[PDB]
Each structure stands twice: as C-alpha cells, then as structure tokens.
Amino acid sequence: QPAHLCFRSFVEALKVDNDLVEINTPIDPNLEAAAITRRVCETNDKAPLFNNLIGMKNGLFRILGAPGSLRKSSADRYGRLARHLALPPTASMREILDKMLSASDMPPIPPTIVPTGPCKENSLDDSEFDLTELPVPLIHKSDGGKYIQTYGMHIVQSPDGTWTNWSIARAMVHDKNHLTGLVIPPQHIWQIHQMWKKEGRSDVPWALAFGVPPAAIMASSMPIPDGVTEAGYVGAMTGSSLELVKCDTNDLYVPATSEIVLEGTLSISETGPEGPFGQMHGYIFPGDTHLGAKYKVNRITYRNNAIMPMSSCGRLTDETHTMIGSLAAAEIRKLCQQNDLPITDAFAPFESQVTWVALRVDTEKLRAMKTTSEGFRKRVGDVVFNHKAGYTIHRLVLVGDDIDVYEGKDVLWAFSTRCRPGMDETLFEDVRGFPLIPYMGHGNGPAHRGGKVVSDALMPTEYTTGRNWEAADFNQSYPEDLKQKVLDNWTKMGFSHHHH
Amino acid sequence: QPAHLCFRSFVEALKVDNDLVEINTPIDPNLEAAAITRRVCETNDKAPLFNNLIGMKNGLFRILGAPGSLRKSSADRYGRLARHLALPPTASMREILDKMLSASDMPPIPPTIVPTGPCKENSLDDSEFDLTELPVPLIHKSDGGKYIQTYGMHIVQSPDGTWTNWSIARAMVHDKNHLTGLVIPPQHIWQIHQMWKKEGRSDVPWALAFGVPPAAIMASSMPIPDGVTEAGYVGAMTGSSLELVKCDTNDLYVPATSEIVLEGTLSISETGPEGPFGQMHGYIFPGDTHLGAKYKVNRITYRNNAIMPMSSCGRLTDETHTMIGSLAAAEIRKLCQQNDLPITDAFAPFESQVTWVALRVDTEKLRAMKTTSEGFRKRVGDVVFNHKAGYTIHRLVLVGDDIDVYEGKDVLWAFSTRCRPGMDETLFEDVRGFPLIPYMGHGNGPAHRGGKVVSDALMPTEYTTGRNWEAADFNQSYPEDLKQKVLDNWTKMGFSHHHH
Ligand SMILES: Cc1cc2c3c(c1C)C(C)(C)C[C@@H](O)N3c1c(nc(O)[nH]c1=O)N2C[C@H](O)[C@H](O)[C@H](O)COP(=O)(O)O
Ligand SMILES: Cc1cc2c3c(c1C)C(C)(C)C[C@@H](O)N3c1c(nc(O)[nH]c1=O)N2C[C@H](O)[C@H](O)[C@H](O)COP(=O)(O)O
Ligand SMILES: [K+]
Ligand SMILES: [K+]
Ligand SMILES: [K+]
Ligand SMILES: [K+]
Ligand SMILES: [Mn+2]
Ligand SMILES: [Mn+2]
C-alpha cells in the first residue's frame, strides 16, 4: 500500500529515507520515550521508532515519535509532512498547503467499505483489556495522566448520519476502560457532541483510530468546513476512495489499515479529571486539572506488531506547530479569498509559537479597492476571527508582496518595521479566544473571549500608488551584474551546499 | 599599541584571528566594496580589508568593512566586538555590555595631550584636497550621496569648554570641501549644536576622526549621559588615559593614532541636501532627500597607508544592530536600575530589527513591590521612553527570570505566549519617536511623536506568589537523571561541536 494511505507503509518510507532511528533495546514509556522524542523535536533529528517498549504485552504496542516534525536540512525540511501526502520530500510549504486545500473545490470521493483489513488481526473485548496495563506514555513529568491519544483520529457522526467527522483531540487514560479528554467549542467533536446532547437519548457512538492513513491524519488536523466529512475530502485530495471497515461493536467505519482501534462511546452526561498536559505553546501548569469529556472503551482491535504514533509536544518544533498552525493558515487563506479579500498566501510563523498568521496581500488588488488600513484591518479581522478557522490564531499580520510569509525572519522584519504599535492595529475583544494560550486561560482577562489583533504591516503607499522603498540588502541595493560578479569571485577573494 | 587603543592594531588582531580577508586586487568604491561588505554582514563572514581601492591617491584610502559585525560560530559570535574592548573573543553579550557600563561608576580618566602621533604623518590643506576626488564609497545603489562617514567619530565641544562629545552620525560628501549629515534631536551633536546656535557668534569647531581607538568608537555609539565627556569614560573603562593630539586648525583634540582626520566647522546657519541612505531598519526610500546639517572641511590629516572603516548597513546583521541596539539596551538597563526598577538584563533582539528591548525582571523584587501589570508597565515606560537612552526603542518587552534576553528565540516565545494583545500593553503616544523607523517617518502618524509600547510578558503570578508553570521542553519537563541518560545514549541509539 502507498505511504500516504497506510501508516505501516509510511514507517517504512521514513526508514528508507534515512529519516528513522529504530531503537530495539528497552525504553520506558514513563517519560523516556517522550524525552527522546522531545529531544528529536528540538533538534530536528530523525523520527524514533521504539520497537521494545517496557510493558508491551500481546502486541500492544510499539511507538513512533515525531511523525510530523521537521528534518534538519533546509532542502527536505518538510519531508515528513510530504510523505503524509505522496509529495516529493523537497516539497515547499506552499505545495503542501495547496495539496491540503485542493479538495476544497472538488467533489468528495466517498469511502469504500471492505469486509476486513489488518486492523482486525487481533481483538480484545470488555474482559480482556485494561488501559492502565498498556504501555501508555507519560509524556511530560507533570502531566495529569498518561496521554494515550496525541496522534490518533476521533471518529464521531451526527445523529442524522449525514456528517462523519475525523479530528485530533487529546485524551488520557482515566481507568481500565475509560479515557478523558478535551472536547471544546468550536471544534467539530464538540459540535457533534452537542447534537447528541440535545437529542438526549444516548451516548455518542465513537471510535479512536491510531496509525491511520497519513493523509487522513492531516485532514484530521485541518479545520475543513462544518458538515464536511473528512473521509470524502481525503478521498478527493488523494484521488482515491479510502478503504474503511466497520467497527465490531458499533456502526462506525475505521480505516482498514489502522494500527490500533478503540471502539466505544463519548458520554453525553459524564465528565472526569483531565490534564494538565504539556501543550503546543510550550507550557504545563502543574496541578491545573479540570473536568473533561469521558469516553468509554468497549473493544480494542489492532494490527499484528501494532505501532502507536505519539506527539511529544511543547516548545518548537513538533506536530502542534507544523500541522495545527500551517493547516489553520491554509484554511484562513482560502476563507479570505472566498470573502473577496486579496490574500495570496498565509502561514503561522513558528517564531510566534503558531499564534500569529501572516497574510500576504496582492497589493495591486488592494490598490484597486481604494481603501485604508483601518477599514481593511477591520474587514480581515471580522472575516477570520468570527470563523472557526481563526480560532487558534490571536494576531494577524498583513504584509505586502515582497514578503515571503513562509520565512519567519521576513515576517518578523516586516512586523517590526512597518506596523506602528497602536495606530496600525485593531484589537478585537468580542471574538472567541483560544484559552490554551497562557495569556488567555492563565492570564489577566477572560479566558474565552478577546485578546486578538490585526497588525497592519502594509506601508501607506501600498494602498495608493505602490511600494516606494527598496530594501537595504544585498538583493535589492546592488545591480544584477554587480551581484553576480561578487558571487562569482566570492571564494577567489577568500570568503566561504543546498542539500547538506 | 594594543588593539583596543589603536585601530591599526585592531586590523592586525582581526588578521591574526583569521577574521579578516585582505583583498589586494582592485575594488570599486562605487558599490562593489559595499556589496561585498553587505554580503559579509548577511552571512557573518570575515571582515573585508580592501587594500586596492580604485581611485586611492596619495595614501587616501584603504577600506575595512564590517568592523563590528558578527562571526559565524556561536562560540566567538561577538568576537569582533570583544576585540574593540580587550575582552576575550568568546565573551558573551552580558560581558561586553558590562564592560561598556563599567565606567558609569568610576571617576573619569581624562585624556593625555601628546605633541604628535601617526595621524599627523600626512596632511592636505584647503588648496590640496577635494572630497569629490577621494574614493568615497557609494554604499547602496539609491543613496543620495557618497557616504564617507559611517564609522568615524564626530568631535564637538560645548561653548563653555566643559563637555567634549564623541558620537557617530552619518555624513556624505556635498562638494569638494563640505559634507552634509544628520544632526537630530535628542542626540548630543544636536544638543551641542543648539548651544552654539543660541550663542550665535560662530560656527561650531569640529573634527571627524576615522579609524579611532576601537574602545572610543564603541563609546561613540553609546548613549552615555548628557554632559559626560566620552574620552574620560573610555579612559575609565580601559583603565588608561587616551593619548590625544591637537588639531592643526582648531583647538579640538583627536586620538593620536586616528587613521584619517577632517578638521573644520559645523555650520550654525547653513544646510544642504542629505540622504537618502540605506539605513539600520533595512530600507532606503529613493528620492527622499531632506536638508541636513552642513560641515566645512578645512584640513585633512592622515596616517601613512590610511584605512577608512565602513559600515554597509541595512538588513541584519551589521554595526547598526550590534552597536546601536545593544549599547542602548545597556544604558536602558542602568537607567532602570537607577530608578529603582527590578531589571537585571536588557537586550535589543536582532529579530526586532533592534526596535524592541527585552527587560529581564527580578521577579522576587517585583513581588515585594506588590504592584500590578498596568502600574508597572506605566512606570517602566515613563522612565525609558522619556529618556534619551530610549530614543531608538519603540517596544519594551518585560520578561521574567526564566528568559534569557540575549536569546531572541526565547524573547519571541515569551512575547508570543505571555503578553495578551491590548490588555497586557500600554501605548505611549506623547513621547519622542524615532523617525528613522519606516512606520514613523514614512507611516500613518506623526513622524516624531508616539508609536511606542510597553508589552508585559510577565505572567500574573509573577507579581504575587511566583511562577506556576514549567516549560514543556526537554530541560524542564524531564528529571535530571533521565535527561543525562538520554544525552549519554544519544549517539549509541543512532541520533546526531561547540567551537565549530
Ligand atoms: C495535530 C494535533 C492537533 C490537535 C492536538 C494535537 C495534535 C498533535 C495534540 C498533541 C493531541 C494536542 C492537542 O492540543 N490537540 C488538540 C487539538 N484540537 C483540540 O480540540 N483538542 C486537542 O486536544 N488539535 C487541533 C485539531 O486537530 C484541529 O483544530 C482540527 O481542525 C480539529 O478538527 P475539526 O474539529 O475541524 O474537524
Ligand atoms: C554605530 C552607528 C551609530 C549610528 C549611526 C551609524 C552607526 C554605524 C551609521 C552607519 C553611520 C548610520 C547612522 O544612522 N548612524 C547615526 C547615529 N546616530 C545619529 O544621530 N545619526 C546617525 O546618522 N548612530 C547612533 C549614535 O551613534 C548613537 O545614538 C550615540 O548614542 C550617539 O552619541 P551621543 O549623542 O549619545 O553622544
Ligand atoms: K478535521
Ligand atoms: K502599517
Ligand atoms: K556617545
Ligand atoms: K502578561
Ligand atoms: Mn471537521
Ligand atoms: Mn555623548
């Protein structure tokens, strides 16, 4: 099976790419696996495959860390991401985001039901598993539980059967047969939970699939629109219908090659302690436990020699930056274009801990609008911050055509030099805030409202007659024939490879 | 003579450090020298010494580019700066800034007058030079003139003789015997010019010395207090009295080993076209010529085989970032401590294009003040933004004890995650602004007022009971014995030098 359609094939692809280290000696799931993974993420090293987990029993489980993290070289920086999508490993960020947006103007390709697949190779009923006995990792030293769920896909369906959502949301082991996790607005798992709660008749049929098709975990991490079934979007994106098999104890459908599948229910009434968790902005507040949603597990099915993917998230750079930030940015690009705003490109700079999105403006288009910074800031911020795709993002930075939004150094340059503090910004206090950001949920103001800003790093003439500066840099402040002469004589004179 | 006391010795020190490239083939001062220098600055390469300048006549002149720029390795990153001050080349930023502040609580060491020195080896009178015939560089393609003055020291004295100031301010050739340049408030050259203008009797006696003692050019770049003679400050800092020789045509005194000396007058009445210039924020606005101050040159004296230092300034990283930003930060640290604020460290992040200063707070001290973010922001901003040492700085970022302000990644992390936009900031509109920043002088609001902000990246409990988080990073989220185990097994497992 292809790497983008089968997680086991994806692991082999990373091996073959010399982007994997197989660790075959015993590693403790209590902190050690995650500490190695954290080190990998902080240094852009090879992904670790832990083949010998202390406490693995009857095939459950190996761990792959850092599945969507960065590579060290510039040339294949995003190569792990590319391998989720059948793209060349030297793909740029723009190419990866365009692949994830491509299905937005295509008919869905609904999934294909097959009678079995590798995820049915083994099963454990209600009397045969205990989630507290599996080698679930403790990811950070102060975490409030063992976070089994950092890179699986929650599967829930609307009561009327018309929408089946696939998403990533964290969950931890509560007891032998229950998890607790985050289910918060405006996320689709929460929106669907609310529909079940309003109907009031039963708990939500649920499945959690780990080691799913890499293209499916990417869509799981992307804010595609309300009511759109991720399976059909991924089918469109990849050009192929995804093969799904029915759960044994409910009527949901899971990827046939899922490594591990939990089947059960998401309660419409019960809660349980959840968190704290070391999270995407780089923090853990020890002892900050709150009540989260509660899931009951009725059945586990799994592949022979099952592998659980794990994100050891926190400070730069891991899946919470490369996937959450970038895929929100992509959806924000599209949303702005659909609202007739002249946005060409969007990216969440890693240096902002993916709390900012830089929006590259087609300033020829802007000039024809004959508008002003105040008006334009307001319009952009009303579109993005009143939509779900803006949820996680607290600062939008508008930049002109000379800035590459995929390069955080240039975004930082433009923000620092072109946006006058106060005057060139509009604050938004009556929008949904992201409470996970420390300055929200642990800050001075309301955890769930406000704290957002549009910062205009367009210069005045970009609205009127055109750019009226040149950069004071080697590229822009010297003529071409001089530049080339300097480059050609560089090593001759005494001064000091693209792949490496 | 020691490197920190003699520019010629400094050049030799860079050679010996393998931090120089001597270019002995012909290089054009029209753009080529500066383009090589710009490339060096953008890549942290070795400093270029142009020994064969097209148009050099009778010893005037060789050029040394990038005299205070960065080195490529992390271990001796600031080594060129260290060599201005007799510090080891592996000196940290904190050590360099502490050396520049050290004379602030020492008695001055006034200079020593000697009868001659190397700067008198050659001279040209009123009938023998023409500034338009010297190999003055064109630094950027759209510059409004040939900027002879990017790394010399202007020397002016108060009318009453009590204060002699040394400072860097840009100047360009106007004609055969005049320069034009920036002389703007609140800078000391402007403050002294105003005193002469108020007296109204004559033009200001002036000298411009190039290739001065490296320790003197550093103090020239630092906002030491009003009325304090830089020579005596440098004498205190270095522990030695600086040797000065009298000018031939006025009664000012220049460093005895200056490479090149211009003697004349700064007009109290005349102006002339000046700029545009590719400047420290990375921009040039072509055609933006304004009237600047006018200097008359009566005499040139110079060393045999004179070398003119040159800053090819613009985008990161050059002397305008490493010296202007850092030395302002140092003075701001001191100013805050003198006003009883609990600041331990200050640095202008390069990523902000040196428009921000991050202030590290001793949060034990802060807690004992029993204050609030609003009050504390206000107090810090009133102290810094109403002083000259805050002139260039438009954003102050307050951070707690866990942030290393010398590491821009950590400053960016804390600003992005701990400061709520709007709520955690105070805008200052009734302070002096820095008009050179594009969003000031070419922006939407008054070029000379406002546009400043204090951004509080202290968390709420840092004012009350103490830090209540741990970072979700390898250092803070794993116990010590685990960390060391991981590091010790790193290469054994399969994963991947301080000097490199
Ligand atoms: C890639 C990725 C995404 C997320 C998460 C993680 C990773 C690795 C964790 C490591 C598990 C950390 C956790 O904070 N986490 C997470 C989460 N969204 C939540 O509601 N709850 C969460 O606990 N997202 C983001 C969501 O996946 C996206 O916002 C997506 O858009 C949701 O899908 P949908 O509602 O649009 O269908
Ligand atoms: C290191 C350095 C400092 C400065 C400059 C440059 C370099 C390399 C130029 C490349 C020439 C660019 C120019 O923008 N420039 C410059 C300038 N200050 C100005 O009033 N005018 C200027 O044109 N400073 C800053 C000043 O040197 C300091 O602010 C110092 O504090 C002044 O001394 P004082 O008034 O405190 O005595
Ligand atoms: K999704
Ligand atoms: K602006
Ligand atoms: K000075
Ligand atoms: K704050
Ligand atoms: Mn969805
Ligand atoms: Mn001074």
mmCIF file of C-alpha atoms in Angstrom, chain A residues 21-23 27 31-32 34-36 38-40 42-43 45-46 48 139-142 278-279 281-286 312-315 351-353 355-356 395 409-410 412-413 415-424 427 429 437-440 442-446 449-451 453 459-460 468-474 476-479 482 485-487 490 493-496, chain B residues 21-23 27 31-32 34-36 38-40 42-43 45-46 48 139-142 278-279 281-286 312-315 351-353 355-356 395 409-410 412-413 415-424 427 429 437-440 442-446 449-451 453 459-460 468-474 476-479 482 485-487 490 493-496:
data_model
loop_
_atom_site.group_PDB
_atom_site.id
_atom_site.type_symbol
_atom_site.label_atom_id
_atom_site.label_comp_id
_atom_site.label_asym_id
_atom_site.label_seq_id
_atom_site.Cartn_x
_atom_site.Cartn_y
_atom_site.Cartn_z
ATOM 1 C CA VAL A 21 16.026 5.519 14.043
ATOM 2 C CA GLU A 22 14.836 2.101 15.169
ATOM 3 C CA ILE A 23 15.502 1.669 18.881
ATOM 4 C CA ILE A 27 12.679 2.057 26.506
ATOM 5 C CA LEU A 31 8.945 9.644 30.361
ATOM 6 C CA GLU A 32 11.926 8.090 28.452
ATOM 7 C CA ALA A 34 8.785 11.111 25.224
ATOM 8 C CA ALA A 35 12.106 12.653 26.381
ATOM 9 C CA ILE A 36 13.916 11.143 23.390
ATOM 10 C CA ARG A 38 11.238 15.846 22.682
ATOM 11 C CA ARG A 39 14.994 15.991 22.024
ATOM 12 C CA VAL A 40 14.362 14.904 18.416
ATOM 13 C CA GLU A 42 14.029 20.360 19.490
ATOM 14 C CA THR A 43 16.866 19.381 17.193
ATOM 15 C CA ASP A 45 16.529 14.809 14.210
ATOM 16 C CA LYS A 46 15.284 11.543 12.758
ATOM 17 C CA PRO A 48 12.298 7.472 16.716
ATOM 18 C CA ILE A 139 4.822 12.496 28.022
ATOM 19 C CA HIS A 140 5.820 15.279 30.452
ATOM 20 C CA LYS A 141 6.784 14.925 34.120
ATOM 21 C CA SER A 142 3.841 16.984 35.455
ATOM 22 C CA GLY A 278 2.343 19.980 28.211
ATOM 23 C CA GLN A 279 0.907 21.733 25.295
ATOM 24 C CA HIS A 281 2.572 26.844 23.330
ATOM 25 C CA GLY A 282 5.320 25.245 25.410
ATOM 26 C CA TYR A 283 3.789 25.155 28.894
ATOM 27 C CA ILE A 284 2.374 22.925 31.554
ATOM 28 C CA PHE A 285 0.678 24.347 34.699
ATOM 29 C CA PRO A 286 1.081 21.518 37.227
ATOM 30 C CA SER A 312 5.771 14.846 22.422
ATOM 31 C CA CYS A 313 4.542 18.309 22.163
ATOM 32 C CA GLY A 314 5.701 21.521 23.608
ATOM 33 C CA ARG A 315 8.377 24.018 22.611
ATOM 34 C CA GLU A 351 8.641 32.039 15.979
ATOM 35 C CA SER A 352 5.123 33.183 17.157
ATOM 36 C CA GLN A 353 4.503 29.718 18.630
ATOM 37 C CA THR A 355 -0.267 32.177 17.493
ATOM 38 C CA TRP A 356 0.168 34.544 14.581
ATOM 39 C CA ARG A 395 -2.555 38.025 15.764
ATOM 40 C CA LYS A 409 12.687 36.176 9.540
ATOM 41 C CA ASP A 410 10.998 38.214 6.877
ATOM 42 C CA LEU A 412 9.462 39.451 11.815
ATOM 43 C CA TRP A 413 11.291 42.138 9.812
ATOM 44 C CA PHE A 415 6.098 43.409 11.543
ATOM 45 C CA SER A 416 8.890 45.188 13.440
ATOM 46 C CA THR A 417 9.496 47.887 10.874
ATOM 47 C CA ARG A 418 6.125 48.503 9.066
ATOM 48 C CA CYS A 419 3.470 48.211 11.797
ATOM 49 C CA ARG A 420 3.205 51.202 14.188
ATOM 50 C CA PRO A 421 2.183 49.932 17.562
ATOM 51 C CA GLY A 422 -1.479 51.026 18.352
ATOM 52 C CA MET A 423 -2.109 53.128 15.310
ATOM 53 C CA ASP A 424 -1.612 50.417 12.766
ATOM 54 C CA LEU A 427 -7.932 44.980 18.733
ATOM 55 C CA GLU A 429 -12.246 41.904 22.163
ATOM 56 C CA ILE A 437 -2.625 30.206 25.145
ATOM 57 C CA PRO A 438 -1.123 31.106 28.558
ATOM 58 C CA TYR A 439 -2.017 34.740 28.377
ATOM 59 C CA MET A 440 -5.691 33.649 27.872
ATOM 60 C CA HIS A 442 -3.842 31.745 32.798
ATOM 61 C CA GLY A 443 -3.814 35.481 32.116
ATOM 62 C CA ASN A 444 -5.390 38.745 33.179
ATOM 63 C CA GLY A 445 -8.568 38.680 31.226
ATOM 64 C CA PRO A 446 -11.487 36.442 30.134
ATOM 65 C CA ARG A 449 -13.092 35.997 24.726
ATOM 66 C CA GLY A 450 -10.931 38.616 23.106
ATOM 67 C CA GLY A 451 -7.198 39.091 23.078
ATOM 68 C CA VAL A 453 -5.391 41.808 16.977
ATOM 69 C CA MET A 459 3.094 50.652 4.228
ATOM 70 C CA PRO A 460 0.888 53.660 3.281
ATOM 71 C CA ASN A 468 8.199 53.369 -2.566
ATOM 72 C CA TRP A 469 11.228 51.760 -0.975
ATOM 73 C CA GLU A 470 13.958 49.296 -1.802
ATOM 74 C CA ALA A 471 15.442 47.003 0.831
ATOM 75 C CA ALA A 472 18.912 47.852 2.081
ATOM 76 C CA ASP A 473 20.070 44.309 1.391
ATOM 77 C CA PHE A 474 22.419 42.553 -0.976
ATOM 78 C CA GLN A 476 17.853 44.934 -3.707
ATOM 79 C CA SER A 477 20.527 47.547 -3.181
ATOM 80 C CA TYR A 478 23.032 46.425 -5.909
ATOM 81 C CA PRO A 479 22.575 45.882 -9.675
ATOM 82 C CA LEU A 482 27.499 43.514 -9.714
ATOM 83 C CA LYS A 485 30.347 39.429 -10.073
ATOM 84 C CA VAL A 486 30.563 39.330 -6.304
ATOM 85 C CA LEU A 487 29.112 35.830 -6.143
ATOM 86 C CA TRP A 490 33.466 35.075 -3.567
ATOM 87 C CA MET A 493 38.679 36.585 -2.907
ATOM 88 C CA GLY A 494 38.746 34.348 0.340
ATOM 89 C CA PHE A 495 35.216 34.115 1.726
ATOM 90 C CA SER A 496 33.145 30.926 2.331
ATOM 91 C CA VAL B 21 40.148 38.760 4.261
ATOM 92 C CA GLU B 22 42.675 41.054 2.612
ATOM 93 C CA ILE B 23 41.553 41.870 -0.922
ATOM 94 C CA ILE B 27 37.779 47.028 -5.963
ATOM 95 C CA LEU B 31 29.019 49.949 -4.924
ATOM 96 C CA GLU B 32 31.451 46.951 -5.135
ATOM 97 C CA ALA B 34 29.844 47.923 -0.047
ATOM 98 C CA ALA B 35 28.212 44.961 -1.866
ATOM 99 C CA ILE B 36 30.971 42.628 -0.665
ATOM 100 C CA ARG B 38 26.818 43.670 2.719
ATOM 101 C CA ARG B 39 27.245 40.007 1.738
ATOM 102 C CA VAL B 40 29.699 39.562 4.632
ATOM 103 C CA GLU B 42 24.289 38.935 5.807
ATOM 104 C CA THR B 43 26.354 35.792 6.185
ATOM 105 C CA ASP B 45 31.718 36.136 7.199
ATOM 106 C CA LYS B 46 35.189 37.531 7.779
ATOM 107 C CA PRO B 48 36.978 42.608 4.290
ATOM 108 C CA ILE B 139 27.116 52.164 -0.226
ATOM 109 C CA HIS B 140 23.652 51.454 -1.689
ATOM 110 C CA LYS B 141 22.500 51.967 -5.284
ATOM 111 C CA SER B 142 19.856 54.605 -4.431
ATOM 112 C CA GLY B 278 20.086 52.677 3.310
ATOM 113 C CA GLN B 279 19.621 52.522 6.971
ATOM 114 C CA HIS B 281 15.953 49.095 9.720
ATOM 115 C CA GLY B 282 16.729 47.731 6.260
ATOM 116 C CA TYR B 283 15.229 50.370 3.963
ATOM 117 C CA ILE B 284 16.019 53.126 1.548
ATOM 118 C CA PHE B 285 13.282 55.431 0.139
ATOM 119 C CA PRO B 286 14.805 56.641 -3.143
ATOM 120 C CA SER B 312 27.421 48.760 4.884
ATOM 121 C CA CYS B 313 24.307 48.949 6.844
ATOM 122 C CA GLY B 314 20.882 47.642 6.286
ATOM 123 C CA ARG B 315 19.246 44.271 6.875
ATOM 124 C CA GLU B 351 14.807 39.761 15.143
ATOM 125 C CA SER B 352 13.014 43.084 16.046
ATOM 126 C CA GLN B 353 15.479 44.996 13.850
ATOM 127 C CA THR B 355 13.377 48.316 17.677
ATOM 128 C CA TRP B 356 12.496 46.324 20.764
ATOM 129 C CA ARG B 395 8.647 48.369 22.155
ATOM 130 C CA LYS B 409 14.081 32.832 20.281
ATOM 131 C CA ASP B 410 13.234 32.927 23.937
ATOM 132 C CA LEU B 412 9.921 35.767 20.899
ATOM 133 C CA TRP B 413 8.473 32.760 22.753
ATOM 134 C CA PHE B 415 6.206 37.762 23.943
ATOM 135 C CA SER B 416 4.008 35.483 21.814
ATOM 136 C CA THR B 417 2.695 33.379 24.657
ATOM 137 C CA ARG B 418 2.646 35.639 27.804
ATOM 138 C CA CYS B 419 1.561 39.076 26.538
ATOM 139 C CA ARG B 420 -2.169 39.445 25.712
ATOM 140 C CA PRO B 421 -2.518 41.867 22.875
ATOM 141 C CA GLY B 422 -4.114 45.195 24.144
ATOM 142 C CA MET B 423 -4.781 44.183 27.693
ATOM 143 C CA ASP B 424 -1.222 43.484 28.649
ATOM 144 C CA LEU B 427 0.707 52.613 24.403
ATOM 145 C CA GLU B 429 1.721 58.465 22.265
ATOM 146 C CA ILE B 437 11.760 53.630 11.583
ATOM 147 C CA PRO B 438 9.623 53.264 8.418
ATOM 148 C CA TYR B 439 6.347 53.136 10.233
ATOM 149 C CA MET B 440 7.271 56.541 11.815
ATOM 150 C CA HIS B 442 7.056 57.069 6.249
ATOM 151 C CA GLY B 443 3.968 55.907 8.129
ATOM 152 C CA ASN B 444 0.452 56.925 9.061
ATOM 153 C CA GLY B 445 1.095 59.122 12.007
ATOM 154 C CA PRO B 446 3.359 61.911 13.355
ATOM 155 C CA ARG B 449 5.918 61.553 18.389
ATOM 156 C CA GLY B 450 4.395 58.399 19.760
ATOM 157 C CA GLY B 451 4.257 54.900 18.379
ATOM 158 C CA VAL B 453 4.504 50.455 23.676
ATOM 159 C CA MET B 459 2.513 36.150 33.881
ATOM 160 C CA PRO B 460 0.028 37.088 36.666
ATOM 161 C CA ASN B 468 3.300 28.479 38.368
ATOM 162 C CA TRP B 469 4.311 26.689 35.194
ATOM 163 C CA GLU B 470 7.092 24.521 33.863
ATOM 164 C CA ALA B 471 8.167 24.661 30.228
ATOM 165 C CA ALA B 472 7.133 21.763 28.023
ATOM 166 C CA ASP B 473 10.714 21.322 26.858
ATOM 167 C CA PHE B 474 13.473 18.781 27.223
ATOM 168 C CA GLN B 476 12.129 21.371 32.270
ATOM 169 C CA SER B 477 9.746 18.514 31.630
ATOM 170 C CA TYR B 478 12.097 15.552 32.456
ATOM 171 C CA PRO B 479 14.139 14.762 35.601
ATOM 172 C CA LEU B 482 16.665 10.865 32.723
ATOM 173 C CA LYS B 485 20.721 9.143 30.377
ATOM 174 C CA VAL B 486 19.240 10.306 27.104
ATOM 175 C CA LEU B 487 22.227 12.514 26.341
ATOM 176 C CA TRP B 490 22.152 9.672 22.089
ATOM 177 C CA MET B 493 20.900 4.831 19.877
ATOM 178 C CA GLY B 494 21.560 6.457 16.346
ATOM 179 C CA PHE B 495 20.923 10.194 16.593
ATOM 180 C CA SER B 496 23.395 13.045 15.830
#
